[PDB]
Scaffold this active site. Structure first.
Site, short mmCIF file in Angstrom:
data_model
loop_
_atom_site.label_atom_id
_atom_site.label_comp_id
_atom_site.label_asym_id
_atom_site.label_seq_id
_atom_site.Cartn_x
_atom_site.Cartn_y
_atom_site.Cartn_z
N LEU A 29 0.83 -1.22 0.00
CA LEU A 29 0.00 0.00 0.00
C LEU A 29 0.85 1.26 0.00
O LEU A 29 0.42 2.34 -0.48
CB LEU A 29 -0.92 -0.02 1.23
CG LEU A 29 -1.94 -1.16 1.24
CD1 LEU A 29 -2.82 -1.16 2.51
CD2 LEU A 29 -2.83 -1.10 -0.03
N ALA A 31 5.42 2.45 0.70
CA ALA A 31 6.74 2.03 1.15
C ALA A 31 7.73 3.16 1.09
O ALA A 31 7.64 4.02 0.20
CB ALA A 31 7.25 0.86 0.29
N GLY A 32 8.60 3.21 2.08
CA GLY A 32 9.72 4.12 2.10
C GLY A 32 10.99 3.32 1.95
O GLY A 32 10.95 2.15 1.55
N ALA A 33 12.10 3.97 2.29
CA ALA A 33 13.42 3.37 2.20
C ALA A 33 13.59 2.21 3.18
O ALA A 33 14.29 1.23 2.86
CB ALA A 33 14.48 4.46 2.50
N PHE A 34 12.92 2.30 4.33
CA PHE A 34 13.19 1.38 5.43
C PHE A 34 11.97 0.57 5.89
O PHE A 34 12.08 -0.25 6.80
CB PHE A 34 13.75 2.16 6.61
CG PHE A 34 15.00 2.97 6.27
CD1 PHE A 34 16.17 2.33 5.90
CD2 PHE A 34 14.98 4.37 6.33
CE1 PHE A 34 17.32 3.08 5.57
CE2 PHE A 34 16.13 5.12 6.01
CZ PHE A 34 17.30 4.46 5.63
N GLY A 35 10.83 0.81 5.27
CA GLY A 35 9.58 0.26 5.78
C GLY A 35 8.52 0.17 4.71
O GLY A 35 8.70 0.73 3.62
N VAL A 37 3.94 -0.85 4.13
CA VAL A 37 2.64 -1.23 4.63
C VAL A 37 2.05 -2.13 3.56
O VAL A 37 2.05 -1.77 2.37
CB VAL A 37 1.72 0.02 4.84
CG1 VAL A 37 0.31 -0.41 5.23
CG2 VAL A 37 2.26 0.84 6.01
N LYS A 57 2.07 -2.74 8.93
CA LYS A 57 3.26 -1.92 8.73
C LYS A 57 4.44 -2.74 9.27
O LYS A 57 4.33 -3.36 10.33
CB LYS A 57 3.15 -0.57 9.49
CG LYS A 57 4.31 0.42 9.17
CD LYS A 57 3.98 1.83 9.73
CE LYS A 57 2.93 2.53 8.84
NZ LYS A 57 2.70 3.98 9.27
N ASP A 168 1.93 16.47 10.49
CA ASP A 168 2.00 16.37 9.02
C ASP A 168 0.57 16.26 8.47
O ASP A 168 0.27 15.40 7.63
CB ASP A 168 2.85 15.18 8.57
CG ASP A 168 3.33 15.27 7.11
OD1 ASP A 168 4.05 14.32 6.69
OD2 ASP A 168 2.99 16.23 6.38
N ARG A 172 -2.87 14.16 1.67
CA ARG A 172 -2.10 12.94 1.38
C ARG A 172 -1.97 12.01 2.59
O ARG A 172 -1.64 10.82 2.40
CB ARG A 172 -0.68 13.29 0.90
CG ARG A 172 0.20 14.03 1.98
CD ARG A 172 1.67 14.25 1.49
NE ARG A 172 2.29 15.08 2.54
CZ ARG A 172 2.16 16.42 2.56
NH1 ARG A 172 1.50 17.07 1.58
NH2 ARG A 172 2.66 17.07 3.59
N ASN A 173 -2.18 12.53 3.80
CA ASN A 173 -2.05 11.75 5.04
C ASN A 173 -3.39 11.44 5.69
O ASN A 173 -3.44 10.98 6.83
CB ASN A 173 -1.08 12.45 6.02
CG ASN A 173 0.35 12.46 5.49
OD1 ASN A 173 0.75 11.53 4.80
ND2 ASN A 173 1.13 13.48 5.84
N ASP A 186 -0.64 8.15 10.29
CA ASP A 186 0.82 8.38 10.30
C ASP A 186 1.44 7.58 9.14
O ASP A 186 1.41 6.32 9.14
CB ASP A 186 1.40 7.93 11.65
CG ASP A 186 2.91 8.18 11.76
OD1 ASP A 186 3.53 8.61 10.76
OD2 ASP A 186 3.45 7.93 12.85
C1 LIG Z 1 0.18 3.21 3.63
C2 LIG Z 1 -0.59 4.02 4.67
N1 LIG Z 1 -1.31 3.29 5.73
C3 LIG Z 1 -0.75 3.22 6.98
O1 LIG Z 1 0.40 3.72 7.19
C4 LIG Z 1 -1.45 2.55 8.08
C5 LIG Z 1 -0.86 2.47 9.44
C6 LIG Z 1 -0.80 3.61 10.26
C7 LIG Z 1 -0.21 3.48 11.52
N2 LIG Z 1 -0.20 4.51 12.46
C8 LIG Z 1 -1.04 5.59 12.51
O2 LIG Z 1 -1.83 5.85 11.58
N3 LIG Z 1 -0.93 6.34 13.63
C9 LIG Z 1 -1.55 7.58 13.92
C10 LIG Z 1 -2.71 8.06 13.25
C11 LIG Z 1 -3.24 9.32 13.60
C12 LIG Z 1 -2.63 10.14 14.58
C13 LIG Z 1 -1.47 9.65 15.22
C14 LIG Z 1 -0.93 8.38 14.89
C15 LIG Z 1 0.27 2.24 11.99
F1 LIG Z 1 0.79 2.16 13.26
C16 LIG Z 1 0.22 1.12 11.18
C17 LIG Z 1 -0.36 1.26 9.92
CL1 LIG Z 1 -0.45 -0.21 8.95
C18 LIG Z 1 -2.71 2.02 7.85
C19 LIG Z 1 -3.23 2.10 6.53
C20 LIG Z 1 -4.52 1.54 6.28
N4 LIG Z 1 -5.04 1.62 5.02
C21 LIG Z 1 -4.40 2.20 4.00
N5 LIG Z 1 -5.03 2.22 2.80
C22 LIG Z 1 -4.35 2.57 1.55
C23 LIG Z 1 -3.13 2.78 4.20
C24 LIG Z 1 -2.55 2.73 5.50
#
Ligand SMILES: CCn1c(=O)c(-c2cc(NC(=O)Nc3ccccc3)c(F)cc2Cl)cc2cnc(NC)cc21
Length: 306
Positions: A29, A31-35, A37, A57, A168, A172-173, A186
């Site tokens: 879904l 990806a960065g350099a080190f991680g 999802v 993630k 942030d 986009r977020n 995040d």
């Molecule tokens: C690629 C982006 N993405 C994500 O990074 C995450 C995701 C977010 C956080 N963490 C947070 O979101 N933390 C957070 C949120 C709000 C305020 C503070 C912290 C986490 F631990 C682990 C995951 Cl897997 C879920 C996600 C679900 N569905 C998607 N659909 C395309 C994209 C998603």
């Protein structure tokens, strides 16, 4: 009157633990350099006889200690915050017997920015020529944009109530899921910022300068009220149907000077006046004159009920 907590010191409640052998990984879904999802299926995560789609993630082989800490910190931060309809909700984690995995709900429509960009034909400019339409059950309207503004304000009010600054906030977020429900995310470990032009080098860091409050850009100050500035920029992205902010202006010496001088974006065509008024107040140079998120929610409530 606040200090910052080191998130590595927050507790991890072992109630979240889930066996990794009950996950089946699918497409990436983000990806960065080190991680990265991945979308995945979890078996018996919530009910023992049910499978469900989740996001997971994890780190790549290239990661080091700072990234391992960063991932555990994401887990600890979500555990701390708890659930709210308008933020990504934690469902579980795998912290033993292999690489750390953090499991959350899967947001099925992806990020709000790309979603808005593919819904532009739901809207038209203020002109006096005849227009032809086509039926489309998946169209957007102004009420949807107002709902996205309200949902993101409620999610941010929730974060502020938990003493959390997101740092942030941008279309986009923010993710979109079933029911057209928006979820603040995040995107750490889920984007390579070196290849996203929205993150500009300023000194030592790559920063989302067009979304940032002047006190953040110039003084490295981050508060509840600096998040409110970013929310104002997000509203502008929203009612502009996904336009880049400050369209056509690069982040350079001139941009910085103009921000300091008080220049701001003009109203998007599709923004109600009251919504532009909110954006303008979010961009006050004095952080003390910006509304709080609790105040924004109260304001948007008044106009949604009218
Ligand atoms: C690629 C982006 N993405 C994500 O990074 C995450 C995701 C977010 C956080 N963490 C947070 O979101 N933390 C957070 C949120 C709000 C305020 C503070 C912290 C986490 F631990 C682990 C995951 Cl897997 C879920 C996600 C679900 N569905 C998607 N659909 C395309 C994209 C998603």
């Amino acid at each position: 009157n606040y200090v910052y907590i080191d998130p590595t010191q927050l507790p991890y409640d072992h109630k979240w633990e889930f066996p990794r052998n009950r996950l089946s990984f699918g497409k990436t879904l983000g990806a960065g350099a080190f991680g990265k999802v991945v979308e995945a299926t979890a078996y018996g995560l919530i009910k023992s006889d049910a499978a469900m789609t989740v996001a997971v993630k994890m780190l790549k082989p290239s990661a080091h200690l700072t990234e391992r800490e960063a991932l555990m910190s994401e887990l600890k931060v979500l555990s701390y915050l708890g659930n709210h309809m308008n933020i990504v909700n934690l469902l579980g984690a795998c912290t033993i017997g292999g690489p750390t995995l953090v499991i959350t709900e899967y947001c099925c429509y992806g990020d709000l920015l790309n979603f808005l960009r593919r819904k532009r034909d739901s809207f038209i400019c203020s002109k006096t020529s005849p227009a032809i339409m086509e039926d489309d059950e998946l169209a957007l309207d102004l009420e949807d944009l107002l709902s996205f503004s309200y949902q993101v304000a409620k999610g941010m009010a929730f974060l502020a109530s938990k003493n959390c600054i997101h740092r942030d906030l941008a279309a986009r977020n923010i993710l979109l899921t079933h029911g057209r429900i928006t979820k603040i995310c995040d995107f750490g470990l889920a984007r390579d910022i070196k290849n996203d032009s929205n993150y500009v080098v300023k000194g030592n860091a790559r920063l989302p300068v067009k979304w940032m409050a002047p006190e953040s850009i110039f003084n490295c100050v981050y508060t509840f009220e600096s998040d409110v500035w970013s929310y104002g920029i997000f509203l502008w992205e929203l009612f502009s149907l996904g336009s880049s902010p400050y369209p056509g202006m690069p982040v350079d010496s001139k941009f910085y000077k103009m921000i300091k001088e008080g220049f701001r974006m003009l109203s998007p065509e599709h923004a109600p006046a009251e919504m532009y008024d909110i954006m303008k107040t979010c961009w006050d140079a004095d952080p003390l004159k910006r509304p709080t998120f609790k105040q924004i929610v109260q304001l948007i409530e008044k106009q949604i009920s009218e």
